[PDB]
Amino acid sequence: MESLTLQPIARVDGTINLPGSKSVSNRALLLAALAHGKTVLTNLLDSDDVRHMLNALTALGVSYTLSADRTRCEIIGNGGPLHAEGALELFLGNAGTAMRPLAAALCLGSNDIVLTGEPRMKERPIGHLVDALRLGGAKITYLEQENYPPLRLQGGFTGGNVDVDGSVSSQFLTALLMTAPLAPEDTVIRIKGDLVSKPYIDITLNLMKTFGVEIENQHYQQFVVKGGQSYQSPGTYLVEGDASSASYFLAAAAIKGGTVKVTGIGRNSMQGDIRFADVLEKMGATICWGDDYISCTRGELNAIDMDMNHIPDAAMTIATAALFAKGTTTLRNIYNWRVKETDRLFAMATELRKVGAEVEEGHDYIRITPPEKLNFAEIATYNDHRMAMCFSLVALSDTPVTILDPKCTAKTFPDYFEQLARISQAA
Ligand SMILES: C[C@](O[C@@H]1CC(C(=O)O)=C[C@@H](OP(=O)(O)O)[C@H]1O)(C(=O)O)P(=O)(O)O
């Protein structure tokens, strides 16, 4: 087992040029592949999630070229639905933002392809999306456990009246939204009940409009999509820096700054995780908003009790930042923490307790009572990039912390530790 030990960081201060948004990157890649024309993505994220998406596009016959730092990508649009026959296997590694969207997109036409990935991918639910796709005409077969990948897609999604459960993941709706415009018939996507991670739907809609497609959003309860559309290359597209990745650095400043400025995202960003800054502000930190930056300056840190359903990922960062806040922090309505890279509620509670916190792992919430002082712990990361990044913040104290499998950050942020070190100051 590989590990990285972070020595206590006395102060953080500096500027970080954010890696590209993983959410935006994979949506842009898929739309670029389906679109007509050449799309040039800039500030594209170079991480495992994107590499796996790129690998899948290659397997699907899409042509593209990458710059040296793999942040600039020129994609030759397919000019319509990707075609894949022969019941071949499409390996998506561990990119859920590839698996979900492609599961839907490859249901267009008369394909026959099997989607799978690393063993862990088979543990992320996709049943709600399959249910919706089938209502739209798609022929889908679970090759292993019902409601999970691998899936054998045999086309048939034509559109029509489609219900979709949006209570476990916004990604199923996202996948349906990107695929539907290309279906031959108009589609009416009806959300069964609650819709979690709503901000991600806005990212999806934003990307779709950029690629030439708009739909009718009826208060996020139903989405009317006209079929027979085509995605069009927007020419050059700038990928916003990753707001989720930015949370770690902004939190670092709220805890041990100094002022940390992240560039690549600003007040105009489409990502819901920029709202993470509001939480730090509510906790006592100072936030500065720029056109292409967000900065956080140390103030004080006070515990908060909030519904974090709008920023599920960035919320994990608040969970460890809570170790440094005064009082008990409660993060509510984060049930789907349980169905991601690992069960994050279980994982976060387990590791937080290891560094000294008293933690109540609620079914869909977490209450964190910080200790008077943190203690050393060899943090288990559960093959989850965010566990590694969240716990790196434990080093912003008097105790060092050992992070197991530090390379797991590569899913979305390969250079995480060097970047953290960049803003880590001894004086
Ligand atoms: C889970 C994860 O990131 C997810 C990416 C995502 C998207 O549409 O881009 C929506 C969210 O999922 P949900 O809350 O709607 O299910 C994020 O949590 C991803 O791609 O795995 P990450 O947190 O591991 O980066």
Side-chain angles (χ1 to χ4, degrees):
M1 171 62 103
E2 192 194 315
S3 70
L4 181 173
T5 294
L6 294 177
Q7 299 187 204
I9 300 167
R11 184 186 183 71
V12 297
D13 186 276
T15 298
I16 293 301
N17 169 48
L18 294 173
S21 165
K22 173 254 288 169
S23 289
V24 171
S25 294
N26 277 354
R27 284 171 169 68
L29 281 175
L30 173 60
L31 295 179
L34 296 170
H36 290 73
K38 175 170 63 62
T39 296
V40 178
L41 304 184
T42 60
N43 199 223
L44 185 69
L45 171 67
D46 175 23
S47 76
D48 295 348
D49 268 3
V50 175
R51 174 170 57 76
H52 296 337
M53 172 60 87
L54 288 169
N55 285 170
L57 291 187
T58 292
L60 289 166
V62 179
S63 299
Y64 67 78
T65 66
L66 280 176
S67 62
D69 66 6
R70 299 165 67 75
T71 65
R72 188 169 179 293
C73 185
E74 293 192 47
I75 300 96
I76 300 302
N78 189 57
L82 301 175
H83 301 313
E85 55 184 55
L88 295 182
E89 180 187 281
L90 184 59
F91 197 81
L92 307 179
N94 183 46
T97 47
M99 177 63 73
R100 275 70 177 280
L102 290 173
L106 296 169
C107 279
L108 291 174
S110 55
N111 294 327
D112 186 349
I113 181 170
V114 168
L115 299 194
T116 193
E118 290 162 38
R120 48 183 172 173
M121 283 207 94
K122 300 179 183 184
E123 304 178 5
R124 314 312 161 209
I126 198 157
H128 295 172
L129 173 56
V130 169
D131 288 340
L133 292 172
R134 285 170 168 168
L135 288 174
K139 169 53 177 183
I140 301 172
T141 304
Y142 291 113
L143 296 182
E144 287 180 62
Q145 191 182 322
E146 187 80 0
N147 304 312
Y148 296 81
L151 306 178
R152 179 168 185 174
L153 312 173
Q154 285 172 290
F157 185 86
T158 58
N161 293 153
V162 168
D163 285 337
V164 68
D165 190 324
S167 75
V168 171
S169 182
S170 70
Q171 295 181 58
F172 309 137
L173 178 54
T174 274
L176 289 171
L177 288 174
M178 298 189 287
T179 291
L182 278 35
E185 305 306 310
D186 293 351
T187 305
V188 177
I189 304 164
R190 198 297 293 296
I191 305 305
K192 295 192 182 189
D194 296 329
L195 175 57
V196 298
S197 297
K198 182 156 66 172
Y200 290 95
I201 300 304
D202 296 331
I203 298 178
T204 297
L205 290 177
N206 185 303
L207 269 286
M208 282 170 69
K209 175 175 176 175
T210 289
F211 281 84
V213 174
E214 287 181 278
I215 55 84
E216 192 194 327
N217 180 357
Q218 313 181 319
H219 299 74
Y220 299 84
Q221 285 304 306
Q222 176 169 288
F223 301 76
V224 177
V225 186
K226 295 177 184 175
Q229 298 189 66
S230 295
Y231 284 114
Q232 303 300 325
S233 166
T236 55
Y237 181 76
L238 178 62
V239 176
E240 299 186 348
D242 199 303
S244 300
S245 300
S247 69
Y248 308 108
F249 303 115
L250 296 176
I255 296 160
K256 215 67 178 175
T259 294
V260 174
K261 173 183 295 181
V262 295
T263 59
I265 56 174
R267 55 185 180 244
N268 313 301
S269 292
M270 70 177 83
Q271 294 167 79
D273 274 8
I274 64 174
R275 296 278 76 86
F276 166 80
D278 307 346
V279 182
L280 292 182
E281 205 179 36
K282 294 184 182 181
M283 291 181 82
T286 296
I287 299 294
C288 291
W289 296 88
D291 205 74
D292 193 43
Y293 78 69
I294 300 183
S295 71
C296 177
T297 296
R298 165 71 176 174
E300 71 189 29
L301 276 183
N302 297 304
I304 49 81
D305 179 339
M306 294 172 60
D307 175 319
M308 301 298 265
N309 197 267
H310 59 299
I311 48 175
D313 290 356
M316 297 180 71
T317 308
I318 294 296
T320 41
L323 292 171
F324 305 91
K326 180 167 184 173
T328 301
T329 294
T330 297
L331 311 182
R332 292 172 283 109
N333 197 17
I334 45 177
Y335 177 74
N336 81 187
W337 264 30
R338 294 194 184 283
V339 300
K340 286 165 175 185
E341 288 303 280
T342 187
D343 175 332
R344 292 169 168 169
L345 269 171
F346 174 71
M348 183 65 67
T350 305
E351 305 310 303
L352 283 174
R353 295 189 186 107
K354 285 167 61 183
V355 293
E358 185 186 306
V359 182
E360 175 189 354
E361 175 197 337
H363 176 66
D364 58 8
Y365 65 87
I366 191 169
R367 304 194 63 191
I368 308 156
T369 302
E372 285 292 345
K373 66 177 180 56
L374 299 172
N375 58 263
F376 169 91
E378 179 176 71
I379 305 294
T381 46
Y382 306 75
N383 302 291
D384 184 348
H385 55 149
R386 303 198 184 289
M387 283 300 291
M389 297 184 282
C390 182
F391 282 80
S392 68
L393 306 184
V394 171
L396 300 173
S397 67
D398 298 323
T399 181
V401 63
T402 295
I403 303 300
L404 296 179
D405 189 22
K407 293 294 190 297
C408 72
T409 64
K411 183 183 170 64
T412 59
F413 206 160
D415 298 342
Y416 181 73
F417 292 103
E418 180 282 309
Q419 290 291 283
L420 173 58
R422 184 167 310 214
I423 56 165
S424 294
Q425 310 304 326

